[PDB]
Ligand SMILES: O=c1ccn([C@@H]2O[C@H](COP(=O)(O)OP(=O)(O)O)[C@@H](O)[C@H]2O)c(=O)[nH]1
């Protein structure tokens with residue numbers, strides 16, 4: 001049993017940074033990066049198409065994003081205590097991003113219906129293989145994430161308003177901290193969650209965070 | 221194992237008519253209709269995405285293709301779970317005609333762009349590679365009708381959302397059928413046996429000869 005751990009967090013919270021750190025630490029730990037390059041060049045920049053015109057492209061983006069993530073995660077499944085760290089999960093795709101888009105009217109009722117039906121189906125076929133043993137929540141304020149967006153400077157992301165990040169933050173908080181967000185996957189209510197404050201730059205100040213992860217993994 | 225047979229044909233060629241004749245002819249024969257009622261009122265487990273596509277294909281075609289293909293797959297898979305002796309399952313169209321006739325045409329006509337088309341193909345590959353293995357066809361029956369016959373049959377059935385379909389659209393789909401199933405120029409499918417039936421003549425009360433061709437064809441598989 002490879003233990004499967006999803007790293008969750010708002011845009012530019014520091015997931016890639018954290019996971020690039022973690023993978024360098026044990027031969028028994030592997031990561032699966034979010035398929036961002038694939039979305040940027042399917043130009044066929046569907047990430048950019050969605051940000052530029054979300055009401056036209058959100059549904060299209062959601063379908064490709066989730067599929068590309070599932071493919072990567074399944075592929076990674078093929079050591080002493082192996083751990084697989086996923087950058088986000090099929091659940092954040094649906095219950096954080098897709099849901100917010102529906103709520104903001106970037107997906108209509110039909111698009112949202114078709115999407116949930118698709119996502120339901122995909123998971124009945126592969127829920128079992130990608131069932132998470134734990135979640136690491138990298139928690140950062142919307143303001144922190146907005147600044148880290150500016151820092152990173154992806155051209156597609158520079159139009160993003162603080163209000164968008166807030167909406168996504170509230171979803172993370174409701175799902176992972178308050179545990180009030182209801183999903184269709186009941187086991188997620190009881191999955192162990194490690195919450196890490198990453199408002200401070202941790203690139204060279206990560207010993208405490210890494211200590212917390214090891215302790216958490218040993219309880220699983 | 222059930223023999224799986226797709227019934228292929230242009231819009232309003234008479235596939236549902238034909239299949240509803242065949243299902244009455246033996247306990248061993250069952251049919252999987254196209255989920256048109258799911259497309260006309262989008263539900264879950266309401267928007268008319270069929271009408272959405274016809275009214276604005278360049279907005280809704282990709283969305284229609286994913287839903288229609290998933291709904292077809294689901295319907296065909298649920299059909300598998302006929303103790304009959306010589307069991308035959310007749311599919312109203314297949315995942316192949318979804319991709320290689322309909323979606324291909326919409327991309328060729330610029331209703332789907334390069335990104336939509338890439339995404340759809342990637343999606344179709346995976347969906348079929350993961351859930352279609354048990355849906356491989358043992359045979360195809362091609363109900364062949366001219367584009368003109370189809371157009372008048374569209375007008376006869378009188379589906380509201382189909383009334384704007386031009387002859388040229390039917391021609392394009394007709395060519396795709398001919399090329400795939402007759403000329404075999406168009407994707408194991410290169411090898412699947414095909415029965416071609418001419419259905420230009422009304423067959424509602426004159427189908428004995430068609431049915432005899434089908435019985436014989438099935439007896440060769
Ligand atoms: O402790 C940190 C964490 C992140 N970053 C930067 O903040 C931006 C977003 O981080 P990352 O790509 O990891 O975020 P993700 O979107 O993967 O959550 C990138 O420029 C990082 O280099 C940083 O400077 N110090």
Ligand SMILES: O=c1ccn([C@@H]2O[C@H](COP(=O)(O)OP(=O)(O)O)[C@@H](O)[C@H]2O)c(=O)[nH]1
Pocket residue numbers: 229230231232233234235236237238373374376377378421422423424
């Ligand atoms: O021999 C026939 C075959 C079909 N129809 C009519 O043609 C229309 C389209 O047939 P169907 O729905 O079966 O076509 P499909 O789209 O399923 O190919 C319907 O009004 C049928 O009643 C007919 O009058 N005589």
Ligand SMILES: Nc1nc(Cl)nc2c1ncn2[C@H]1C[C@H](O)[C@@H](CO)O1
Pocket residue numbers: 011034036047050061062065066092093094097098101157
């Ligand atoms: N399901 C998703 N729906 C949307 Cl609209 N966006 C997403 C999704 N998953 C990742 N991103 C975005 C957030 C970042 O801008 C970028 C890399 O995480 O991709």
Ligand SMILES: Nc1nc(Cl)nc2c1ncn2[C@H]1C[C@H](O)[C@@H](CO)O1
Pocket residue numbers: 231254256270273281284285288289317318319322323326382
């Ligand atoms: N893959 C499909 N792509 C499109 Cl654009 N349309 C389809 C498809 N499959 C069936 N139909 C349409 C044709 C008829 O109008 C109706 C019932 O067959 O649905």
